[model samples]
Target: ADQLTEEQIAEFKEAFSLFDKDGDGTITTKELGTVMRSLGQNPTEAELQDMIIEVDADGNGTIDFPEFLTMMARKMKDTDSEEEIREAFRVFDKDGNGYISAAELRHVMTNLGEKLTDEEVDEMIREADIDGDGQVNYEEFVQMMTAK
Candidate 1:
């Protein structure tokens, strides 16, 4: 009825059991770091309490099972957003050279049925291409995506 289905929550639950570590009711400070560090987060203990405050609803300072589910739901959302940006980059960078050049720009622009001239196309490139590279990397591409 919420962010996850029963099957999805089952997997999320299994993962949390490891974080619960001792099979206790809630996850503690050290276990928080264990989960964060394994995911490359490495959050400080002082900083960590605020994270629990963000998701941990109970008067109990650390995270409970349901709290952990909301945490992963946000994680799932952001990771999906990143991959969408990656796919948008692909739409413009057909050759997969890791950046979109003027020729690539021309192809995408025209295919939009907007019929952009080369100069206008190049101008589009100039807006996104930082570092005087005259081409758009995924960093620059996502930058433009956010602005408009």
Candidate 2:
């Protein structure tokens, strides 16, 4: 895992604590399922088992803080890469039309369990639509995300 800044470490610690439920330092399969559900994911039993296997470094069937930190760091690293961001944009562009419409955004958000009103989705599109085309192209999406 890459070295995390103090602030990033603090945030990861807080997130890990949330997943660690039951005041335990490790996250069991059950705890992981609960956390995933909270994040709007309904993973199947096999999927949950696969996830634990992917992150459980010790072969102990649970994720310790170090494992959790490693996973988060990997995700952050992926997000920081342009290629990864492009791939994420492709995922959001459901129609493969090279752009994300406000309707697509609303659909994706709803799938993620975030019930946003049409106005909210339109606002998101407006904020990211640098070209003012009422839709977010890949370039605009990248700029909106990478801008300070």
Candidate 3:
């Protein structure tokens, strides 16, 4: 994976802070669940536990800033192969359509609990819709994601 730039690191820190509701420098499972819900995801308790167990490097039962930052950095990179990226895209295309619509983009973008306006989603589609068909096909998605 590529190293995160200072600006990216700062952005991650800000996002982590949002999830750290108590300002205690750590994110609990409850907080994580809230975040997931805000993003329109309904994760099971088992899944939540597994996520914390997987990312809690120190086994502290909570995610600290350092661990959170590491996770975010990994997520910010497009290190996956084209096939892998395509697989991920499939997961987001809930309707099994080949192209991802703006609504689908909104769902996935907000899945992390990040608040994105309709205009933001439109702008994202515009940026990636190279064919000018107003949707993101597999080729466009791969190109946009793999771009540096």
Query: In the order shown, what is each candidate's alpha-carbon RMSD?
Result: 13.1, 10.0, 11.0
In lDDT terms, which candidate is top?
A: 3
What tens digits encode model 2's per-residue C-alpha lDDT throughout 41-98? 9979888988889988679998888999877656655444678777888878988989
Please identify model 1 stretches exceeding 4 Å from their true place: 1-3, 38-41, 79-148
Model 1 scores what on Cα lDDT? 0.78
List TM-scores for all candidates, in order: 0.48, 0.51, 0.51
Q: Report lDDT per candidate.
A: 0.78, 0.80, 0.81
Tens digit of per-residue lDDT, candidate 3, span 24-123: 8989999989999998999799999888888886788999988897676566566646567868888778898798888887787788786988877778
Tens digits of per-residue lDDT, candidate 1, 51-145, equal 77787666677788888877876665556569888888898899998998888878766777877778887787787776568888876787689
What 10-residue stretch in candidate 2 is worst by lDDT? 72-81
Clashing pairs in 3: none
RMSD from true fold, candidate 1: 13.1
Sort all candidates by lDDT, best to worst: 3, 2, 1
Please give the lDDT score at residue 22 for candidate 2.
Answer: 74
Residue pair clashes in candidate 2: none
